[PDB]
Design a protein around this ligand. Sequence first.
Ligand SMILES: *C(#N)N1[C]C2=C([C]1)C([N]C1=[C]C(C(F)(F)F)=[C][C]=[C]1)=[C][C]=[C]2
Length: 204
Amino acid sequence: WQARGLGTARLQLVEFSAFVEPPDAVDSYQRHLFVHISQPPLESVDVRQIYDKFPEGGLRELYDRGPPHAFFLVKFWADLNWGFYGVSSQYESLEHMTLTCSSKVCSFGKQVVEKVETERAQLEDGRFVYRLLRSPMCEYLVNFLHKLRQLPERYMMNSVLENFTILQVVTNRDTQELLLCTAYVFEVSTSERGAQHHIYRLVR
Ligand SMILES: *C(#N)N1[C]C2=C([C]1)C([N]C1=[C]C(C(F)(F)F)=[C][C]=[C]1)=[C][C]=[C]2
């Protein structure tokens, strides 16, 4: 009954990216992905080890109310060499729901920006999809990339990214119940390698 991917029986994640398109993309399009998830049981990380990096809206509260199986950790190795900055998310379910998608950016485990969005069902192939596509990146985060990208040393980037975390909570708006809560922790990938992720189940 343990998850094989990032999702529950009640809300799969299909794809997720954050990307930059250069102003030169109007003529000859190209995409650069800082992070990307496109979609044997997932490896397991104790939720108590990563309380310190998120508020106390907090990870402890949200796991306490549950459900435990909805909680996931993604480590990202960002690709940080490369305009419009966008984040695209897509989800699926078998229910018609209305989704509310709360993205908390935390620096040293304090909330620094929050984004909250709604997306309603679109029935496609017996399936409900929720397309949150090309949402413009929050200005702090685009600034946090340009500043982070000019660091002399990648261990400096990881040192900064050590204290930079993001908490996404996806809830049915109507029923107010939690569907999917994802903890993001960041490293920089080396320049020759592109973006990577490892996805864990948060347990207790
Ligand atoms: C703001 N803040 N944002 C616009 C937005 C965001 C961030 C997310 N969350 C998210 C962002 C990243 C990355 F920093 F861009 F890599 C990684 C994971 C989650 C989601 C939707 C819109």
